From a paper:
Antibodies to the receptor binding domain ([name]) on the spike protein are frequently encoded by IGHV3-53/3-66 with a short complementarity-determining region (CDR) H3. IGHV3-53/3-66 antibodies carry germline-encoded features that are critical for [name] binding—an NY motif in CDR H1 and an SGGS motif in CDR H233,49,56. Here, we identify two public clonotypes of IGHV3-53/3-66 [name] antibodies with a 9-residue CDR H3 that pair with different light chains.
The heavy-chain sequences of these two antibodies only differ by four amino acids in CDR H3, namely VH residues 96, 98, 99, and 100. Of note, [name]-23 uses IGHJ4, which is seldom observed among clonotype 1 antibodies but highly preferred in clonotype 2 antibodies, to encode the two amino acids at the C-terminus of its CDR H3. Both [name]-23 and COVD21-C8 bind strongly to the [name]-[name]-2 [name], with dissociation constants (KD) of 1 nM and 4 nM, respectively. We further determined apo crystal structures of [name]-23 paired with its native light chain and with the light chain from COVD21-C8 to 2.0 Å and 3.3 Å, respectively. In addition, a type I′ β-turn is observed at the tip of CDR H3 in [name]-23 when paired with its native light chain but not with the light chain from COVD21-C8. The conformations of CDR H3 indeed differ when paired with different light chains, as exemplified by the 3.3 Å displacement of VH G97 near the tip of CDR H3 and different side-chain orientations of VH T98. In particular, we focused on three IGHV3-53/3-66 [name] antibodies that have a CDR H3 length of 9 amino acids—one in clonotype 1 ([name]-23), and two in clonotype 2 (COVD21-C8 and CC12.3). Our biolayer interferometry (BLI) experiments showed that the Y58F mutation dramatically improved the affinity of the three antibodies ([name]-23, COVD21-C8, and CC12.3) by ~10-fold to ~1000-fold.
Author numbering:
A (entry chain L): 1 to 95, 95A, 96 to 212
B (entry chain H): 2 to 82, 82A, 82B, 82C, 83 to 100, 100A, 101 to 113, 121 to 220
């Protein structure tokens, strides 16, 4: 089949910028391409078909160009309502076809380092036989952040999960939660629990830690 | 034009489920009609199409298991699913297709969850304000909403009177097949010990309501 890639995967832009994102196809598909917009929790919206035809109802600041293997969607000036994910699609007779991975457009603001908080597991949870340690990275920009768990100054992998919020509507930052999950037995086998945070807002990694008890 | 979907919900692997899409403002007999799904956090997939004169075609991931059909007299589209798999968990959309999979009109989506887990209310644990969650006049506190199924859960704080500084994070699916999420709020350190902070957790699928006071 045909594979589609999009660039960039992430774009940070301001209201009023001209924005150009790109779709490219593993092989010629020559005008069989559409562009859609999707916002979190809604169906996608068709923007452009036949690589260049604007879909009826779609504002004119949107335009598409290209053919063969390389295609481009442009927003000549960006509005608030435009921050969203954008997908390209190869049109096909039969239902497989292809969607690109998407390009997410978020709101540019100044760099802000995370505010970092750590939470030991509750006595109630420990009574259940499980320990969750929670690290919170609050109100940071840009969205890329690295979280490293360390137990007794030693590095963990595979025992944590991460969740990130959508960009905040008031201050345009992100927040991130990391949960380290251990058996009760493992948890009390060890003393120092630490969350080490790396983010372009920080001049060096910052570590928050507690001693069990 | 309007497309209203129904029939999604929780179903066990190996089970069957039938979706409906009730169409207004145009006649499904005279169109290409399509189902398109979207797994949580992932991209779109066109899985089925029914042509004007009743020819049907399927993506190979659903071929042999899913069946697209319509009732002209009811003006409704249907997706019959059999032998469901965990990977079939997704929001399912019906769409008017202008041919070649060009989707100009979309339903609102219906969530289909394919899992072995039983419906289960969450345990709610405090994320207590401490010295390691206080810096300056700001303190972080929250609730860990652990091991529920299925989505969704709602969390408010102080029955909705407290909304500034709240972050309720998207749930993660754990290896267990159960969901966990945290909800945090940042508040004046001055307020601790005199202001009460309760997280109100509501898990409608298990009829579970929890009110957890969180304190230092």
């Amino acid at each position: 089949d045909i594979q589609l890639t999009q660039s960039p995967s992430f774009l940070s832009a301001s209201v009023g910028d001209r924005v150009t994102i790109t779709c490219r196809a593993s092989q010629g598909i020559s005008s069989y391409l559409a562009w859609y917009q999707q916002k979190p929790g809604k169906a996608p919206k068709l923007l452009i078909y036949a690589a260049s035809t604007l879909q009826s109802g779609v504002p004119s600041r949107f335009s598409g160009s290209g053919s063969g293997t390389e295609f481009t969607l442009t927003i000549s000036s960006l509005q608030p309502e435009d921050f969203a994910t954008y997908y390209c699609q190869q049109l096909d007779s039969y239902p497989p076809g292809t969607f690109g991975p998407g390009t997410k457009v978020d709101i540019k603001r100044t760099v802000a380092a995370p505010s970092v908080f750590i939470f030991p597991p509750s006595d109630e949870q420990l009574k259940s036989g499980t320990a969750s340690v929670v690290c919170l990275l609050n109100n940071f920009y840009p969205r890329e952040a690295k979280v490293q768990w360390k137990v007794d100054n030693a590095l963990q992998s595979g025992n944590s999960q991460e969740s990130v919020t959508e960009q905040d509507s008031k201050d345009s930052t992100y927040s991130l939660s990391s949960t380290l999950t251990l058996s009760k037995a493992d948890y009390e086998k060890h003393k120092v629990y630490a969350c080490e945070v790396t983010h372009q807002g920080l001049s060096s990694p910052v570590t928050k830690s507690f001693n069990r008890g | 034009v309007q497309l209203v979907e129904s029939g999604g919900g929780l179903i066990q692997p190996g089970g069957s489920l039938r979706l409906s899409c009730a169409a207004s403002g145009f006649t499904v007999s005279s169109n290409y009609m399509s189902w398109v799904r979207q797994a949580p956090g992932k991209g779109l997939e066109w899985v089925s199409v029914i042509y004007s004169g009743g020819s049907t075609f399927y993506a190979d991931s659903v071929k042999g298991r899913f069946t697209i059909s319509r009732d002209n007299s009811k003006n409704t589209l249907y997706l019959q699913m059999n032998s469901l798999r965990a990977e079939d968990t997704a929001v399912y959309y019906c769409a008017r297709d202008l041919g070649t999979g060009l989707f100009d009109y979309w339903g609102q989506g219906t969530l289909v969850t394919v899992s072995s887990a039983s419906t289960k209310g969450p345990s709610v644990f405090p994320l207590a304000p401490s010295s390691k969650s206080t810096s300056g006049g700001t303190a972080a506190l929250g609730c860990l909403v652990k091991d529920y199924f299925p989505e969704p859960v709602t969390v408010s704080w102080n029955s909705g009177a407290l909304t500034s500084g709240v972050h309720t994070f998207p749930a993660v699916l754990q290896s267990s097949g159960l969901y966990s999420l945290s909800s945090v709020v940042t508040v004046p350190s001055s307020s601790l010990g005199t202001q009460t902070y309760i997280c109100n957790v509501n898990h409608k699928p298990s009829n579970t309501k929890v009110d957890k006071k969180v304190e230092p």
